[PDB]
Amino acid sequence: SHMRLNVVVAVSENWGIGKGGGLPWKIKKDMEFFKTVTTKAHPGLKNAVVMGRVTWESIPESFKPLKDRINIVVSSTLSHAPSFVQVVPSLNAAIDLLYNEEFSSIVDEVFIIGGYRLYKEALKQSIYPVRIYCTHILSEVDCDTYFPKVDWDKLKKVDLPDIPADTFTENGFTFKFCVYDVP
């Protein structure tokens, strides 16, 4: 109906972005969360996951393209992609593509899975409501690229049944899952 932009991101204590090394793909529990959040769609339909090239490139080969989702990379560089992965120059273009004849009968929800630049564009626009699926992490090492400014004090915490509210510890990482509607 009216598109919500869903942002999926892992953040440290100061909303540093959870990327670099194996992050966030290497935390198994976070991948379950990621897989569930991004794959679950009304029957017949598929969610879209939209991401920058460096996000696309950071994904381990065993994982790529993300099955059962429309994969869209926003890049001007990426010359080629695996069959059925879409490459477009802009977020504008990813959304137009999802509303064009090729995808509009297929798409359910849209997730932006990273790129600082994509997160930033997604948060800064004043047209569509935004929901953030957030993995909070206590970083044993520093995350030094930052998530775009949000007023977290005003974020509306969402309760979803399939989402466990416990804190988890895997490897050196302690984390918890939270879902927010930006008012």
From Swiss-Prot:
Its EC number is 1.5.1.3. Residues 4-182 form the DHFR domain. NADP(+) binds at residues 10, 16-22, 53-55, 75-77, 114-121. CDD domains: DHFR. It is an enzyme of class 1 (oxidoreductase). InterPro entries: DHFR, DHFR-like_dom_sf, DHFR_CS, DHFR_dom. Key enzyme in folate metabolism. Contributes to the de novo mitochondrial thymidylate biosynthesis pathway. Catalyzes an essential reaction for de novo glycine and purine synthesis, and for DNA precursor synthesis. This is Dihydrofolate reductase. The lineage of its organism: Eukaryota, Metazoa, Spiralia, Lophotrochozoa, Platyhelminthes. The gene is DHFR.
